[PDB]
Paper text:
The psychrophilic aromatic aminotransferase from Psychrobacter sp. B6 is a representative of pyridoxal phosphate (PLP)-dependent enzymes. PsyArAT exhibits an activity typical for ArAT: transamination, which is a transfer of an amine group between aromatic α-amino acids and α-ketoacids. The mechanism of active site adjustment toward substrates of psychrophilic aromatic amino acid aminotransferase (PsyArAT) from Psychrobacter sp. B6 is discussed based on crystal structures of complexes with four hydroxy-analogs of substrates: phenylalanine, tyrosine, tryptophan and aspartic acid. These competitive inhibitors are bound in the active center of PsyArAT but do not undergo transamination reaction, which makes them an outstanding tool for examination of the enzyme catalytic center.
In the case of PsyArAT/FOH and PsyArAT/YOH, the ASU is created by a functional dimer; in PsyArAT/DOH the asymmetric unit represented only a monomer, but the functional dimer is reproduced with the symmetry-related molecule. Despite the presence of an inhibitor in the pockets of chain B of PsyArAT/YOH and PsyArAT/FOH dimers, the non-bound form of PLP was present, similarly, as it was in the catalytic center at both monomers of the native enzyme structure. In the PsyArAT/FOH complex, the closest distance between the ligand and PLP (measured from the α-hydroxyl group of the inhibitor to aldehyde carbon of PLP) was 4.1 Å in monomer A and 3.3 Å in monomer B, while in the PsyArAT/YOH structure respective distances were bigger (5.7 Å and 4.6 Å). In the catalytic center of both complexes, the Arg280* switch was in the “down” position; however, in the case of PsyArAT/YOH, it was placed a little deeper than in the PsyArAT/FOH complex. In the subunit A, Arg280*, which was pushed down by a YOH ligand, made two hydrogen bonds between guanidine moiety nitrogen atoms and carboxyl oxygens of Asp11 (2.8 Å and 3.5 Å). In monomer B, only one contact was present with Asp11 (2.9 Å), but another bond was created with the hydroxyl group of Asn132 (3.5 Å). Despite the similar size and aromatic character of FOH and YOH ligands, motions in the structure of PsyArAT complexed with the phenylalanine analog were slightly more significant. The kink on the long helix H14 was at least two times bigger for PsyArAT/FOH (~6° in monomer A and ~4.5° in monomer B) than for PsyArAT/YOH (~1.5° in monomer A and ~2.0° in monomer B). Movements of the N-terminal (~2.7 Å/A, ~3.0 Å/B) and C-terminal (~2.2 Å/A, 1.7 Å/B) parts of the small domain were also bigger for the PsyArAT/FOH complex than for PsyArAT/YOH (~1.2 Å/A, 1.8 Å/B and ~0.5 Å/A, ~1.0 Å/B, respectively). Interestingly, the volume of the pockets in one monomer was much smaller than in the second one of the dimer in all complexes (excluding PsyArAT/DOH), but the difference in the case of FOH bound caused a smaller disparity between them than in the case of YOH present in the active center.
Author numbering:
A (entry chain A), B (entry chain B): 1 to 398
The structure:
């Protein structure tokens, strides 16, 4: 019956993970998975979350369906976070927002909405980018290409080429953009580059789709959202997928948001209604437990403030790891610039190591990265840092 | 920018609900929504669930991604529930199962899988059926039509016409079937009619997709799954979507399962891999909280046994309401047979009332049903029964 069905290769990042677990090097370290670990190398449970969940468990309540858009408080928290509290765009009612099944789920609904209403649009992703972006869009029968982004030569951005690329695109074509904390490179646009980008986006009447999965891990909650807010100030029709997976340490509950910025309230209502309809077609409504956590933590002022602090500690710890890793490298290797390590933002780092060097890191030290050199900085901690930094010096010295 | 966007009419079931809320009749009752309510007119929190959730909160754990297929325990609970404890088909490893975002999510994944690998297959739904079935399938770009089912004349099933219809269909065409507890009619097939249909499905080489959203609300857990188990016995390739929304009273947490019965272990693996790949491109993985609940409740023998007991009481209560409703009607309306009310199974009932009568039921009494005459029996309880039964008497006499 199902002889025609091909085997599924399996998630690539998961394929590596099997190999690491198998590895019997006592000193093995996994830096391959984009998961945040704390000082002790474990996934944290955030204090604010813990508190939110005790409230949810006290008392244990009936579990009616959430609305299709999810909880209003969840929606508002997304909005206030992304566009700023009582931002003009929100007080004008020009943002249609739904809770989603994580950032993935927001990408799916947004892509499906684009596919239905802008059937001609293509989508373009950064070269390189997070593998799942491509699957989600193509899974909607939207054609996906790549725009120039990362400059292998410099470690920077092929900014000129990227800009020239965008001018070739068709009206209503979609750009998948990372407002900060690029996955996998860590290399972000400066504000001035954002203004040029958004300028051409405006001129070419392209659709910007900002995926922000690490708000708070780059500069701060506001800064990380500059690209979003500047697109709003310019009056662009912006799609924003956001995820709480990382910054809430709530990967498994599937919490995120999708927001569509619209030129008029009436368009806001058309789009909101169609987002609902799209949700109804896929999974009907989002999960109550994850949504309640988001609702409680975003809208309780004491919990929100605690939560930002918790995110900033996670960001600060990742920044310390970057600094420490650079300090060892620059102390030990003269005449190579390692500023790109602290210039990069978020959880990810393109190390600049060649595939052969990544592989030698695996064999010789049991240290696991992606072949494109991507390292998750949160994998690093006080207990493994000197071992990893020193292994890296060795591989680069050969 | 979004003037091309059509307004979404809104979920009809949800649309009626708003009119009810707005309604200022002191004695209003809502029988429009397929939600289960206890004797007091409130959504229950089941004891087993409450226990499962105390275990989940003690202690509050890290929240990593579940696997794409969800928790193994959740997958095994679906399987055992659907096909019977340690069934041959399970011991033979011929069932590919994933957790899903409710029954809706399972429908979506199985419809996407069908669309990808059997692009020619069309899907046929019962006339009438639950509104979302169509949207889910059409949302996958699968063409959907209807098979004869409900007989307006007799209140039964146009069984002969249905069977003739199935014989016209192409090989690999999909039938969406309700093992029990038909929505919206309440009218089910007998076991003998099941044997006939599944025979024709076998001879016409059609694909049965069984959606069972109310296991436990018909006769009992095992009886309700007859159509499923008989299809397995016959060696048919079967798709089953199951939902814990009602029978676990866990609508909000989005818990259900998709199961694909395969002729051989190797095909089981192919299908299992692609199900995962399909999950990846939609929402990446399912929610932990809901999945943990299902895991704990299905796999703890004391909780499972308690849980069956809880569903039994819910079913018995619905059955009592059917009997009391019929008794009032037959006592007060001469020469109309109302055995169809007790003959129907599950939460829903096609009351036989015309759209005019349904609408008069709204205007005169604030009693809300679907225009097609669908009533949710769980909406009825000892506090509202007489009032609803007696109002129904008056609409029928005019
Ligand atoms: C680039 C990017 N987008 C989106 C997400 C959100 O994925 P999810 O919320 O399904 O865990 C992540 C993580 C991510 O790194
Ligand atoms: C017959 C039927 N199938 C599928 C579903 C999907 O619901 P859920 O996603 O909550 O399991 C429902 C209920 O909403 C239903 O009544
Ligand atoms: O960026 C990453 O490494 C994550 O995307 C890893 C991942 C991907 C899929 C998944 O089901 C679990 C983890
Ligand atoms: O069968 C019914 O009437 C409803 O239970 C379906 C439903 C449930 C929740 C929802 O957000 C939309 C439709
Ligand atoms: Mg499609
Ligand atoms: Mg110019």
């Amino acid at each position: 019956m199902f002889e025609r069905i091909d085997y599924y290769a399996g998630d690539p990042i998961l394929g590596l993970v099997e190999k690491f677990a198998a590895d019997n090097n006592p000193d093995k370290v996994n830096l391959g998975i984009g998961i945040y670990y704390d000082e002790s190398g474990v996934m944290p449970v955030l204090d604010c979350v813990k508190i939110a969940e005790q409230r949810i468990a006290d008392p244990i309540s009936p579990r009616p369906y959430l609305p299709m858009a999810g909880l209003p408080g969840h929606r508002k928290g997304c909005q206030e976070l992304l566009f700023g509290k009582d931002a003009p765009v929100l007080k004008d009612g020009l943002v249609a927002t739904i809770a989603t099944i994580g950032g993935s789920g927001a990408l799916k609904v947004g892509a499906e909405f684009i596919h239905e209403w802008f059937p001609q649009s293509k989508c373009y992703v950064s070269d390189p980018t997070w593998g799942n972006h491509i699957a989600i869009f193509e899974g909607c029968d939207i054609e996906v290409g790549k725009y120039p982004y990362y400059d292998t030569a410099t470690g920077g951005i092929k900014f000129d080429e990227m800009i020239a690329f965008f001018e070739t695109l068709n009206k209503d074509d979609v750009l998948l953009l990372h407002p900060c904390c690029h996955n996998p490179t860590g290399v972000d646009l400066t504000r001035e580059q954002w203004d040029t980008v958004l300028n051409v986006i405006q001129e070419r009447e392209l659709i910007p789709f900002m995926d922000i999965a690490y708000q708070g891990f780059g500069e701060d909650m506001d800064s990380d959202a500059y690209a979003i807010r500047k697109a709003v100030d310019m009056g662009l029709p912006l799609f924003v997928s956001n995820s709480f997976s990382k910054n809430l340490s709530l990967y498994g509950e599937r919490v995120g948001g999708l927001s569509v910025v619209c030129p008029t309230v009436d368009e806001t209502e058309r789009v909101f209604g169609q987002l609902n309809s799209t949700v109804r077609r896929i999974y009907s409504s989002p999960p109550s437990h994850g949504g309640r956590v988001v609702d409680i933590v975003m809208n309780d002022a004491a919990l929100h403030e605690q939560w930002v602090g918790e995110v900033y500690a996670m960001r600060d710890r990742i920044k310390s790891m970057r600094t420490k890793l650079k300090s060892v490298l620059e102390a030990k290797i003269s005449g190579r610039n390692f500023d790109y390590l602290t210039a990069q933002n978020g959880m990810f780092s393109f190390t600049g190591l060649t595939p052969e060097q990544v592989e030698r890191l695996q064999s010789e030290f049991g240290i696991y990265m992606i072949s494109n050199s991507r390292m998750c900085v949160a994998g690093l901690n006080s207990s493994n840092i000197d071992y990893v930094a020193n292994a890296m010096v060795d591989v680069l010295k050969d």
